[PDB]
Amino acid sequence: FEKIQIIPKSSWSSHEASLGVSSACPYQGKSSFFRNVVWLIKKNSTYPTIKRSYNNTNQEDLLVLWGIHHPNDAAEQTKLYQNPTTYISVGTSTLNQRLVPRIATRSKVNGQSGRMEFFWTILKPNDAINFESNGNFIAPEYAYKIVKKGDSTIMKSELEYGNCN
């Protein structure tokens, strides 16, 4: 198990990855966001269609995580992005999805009203994941190398480690 750079924060030149946070996740007081997935915003006032991908040069197996930002209303659609209708599609040897963001009146939680649906699959050692997005999207920065053998579970306990065996 180890963390890996798939596509850095730097590589998004056509889209604004810097100020992609909100009043919800405080790092050192100041407003932050999930440090392993980047939230994409329009540049100047136009949102280019993204179309990038990742072949797995690594020989260990890995998994990717991504998601969708669901807005509160059609007014917040045109504030963050410059699109009315949006599509996010992901493609791998196995996977085949086409996700549309849902717009609906919510209730407020931890500040922000709209939701954030995440997704995942495991990418084979010698295969490519392909993305395509019009907007309303949160792309991976980091992803994990997994070598799985055998299963267990999530034990629910209050205790802490006792340096034994």
Ligand X SMILES: *[C@@H]1O[C@H](CO)[C@@H](O[C@@H]2O[C@H](CO)[C@@H](O)[C@H](O)[C@H]2NC(C)=O)[C@H](O)[C@H]1NC(C)=O
Ligand Y SMILES: *[C@H]1O[C@H](CO)[C@@H](O[C@@H]2O[C@H](CO)[C@@H](O)[C@H](O)[C@H]2NC(C)=O)[C@H](O)[C@H]1NC(C)=O
Label each residue of 28-71 as H, E or C.
CCCEECCCCEEECECECCECCCECCEEECCCCCCEEEEEEEECC
Rg (CA), the chain: 18
Reduce the DSSP state of residue 5 to 3 states and report it: strand
Reduce the DSSP state of residue 79 to 3 states and report it: helix
Task: Tell whether residue 46 is a contact of ligand Y (CB under 6 A).
Answer: yes
Task: Tell whether residue 44 is a contact of ligand Y (CB under 6 A).
Answer: yes
Q: Encoding tokens for residue 8?
A: 């850095």
Task: Tell whether residue 165 is a contact of ligand Y (CB under 6 A).
Answer: no
Q: How far is the CB of 28 from a second copy (least distance, A)?
A: 39
> Alpha helices, DSSP H only, in the chain?
74-80
Q: How far is the CB of 161 from a second copy (least distance, A)?
A: 43
Q: From the list ligand Y, a second copy, ligand X, none, which binds 46 (C-beta under 5 to 8 Å, kind-based)?
A: ligand Y
Task: Tell whether residue 60 is a contact of ligand X (CB under 6 A).
Answer: no
Select the residue interacting with ligand X from 48, 49, 111, 127 (CB under 6 A).
127
Q: From the list ligand X, ligand Y, a second copy, none, which binds 117 (C-beta under 5 to 8 Å, kind-based)?
A: none
- Could you list the residues that contact ligand X (CB under 6 A)? 55, 107, 126-128
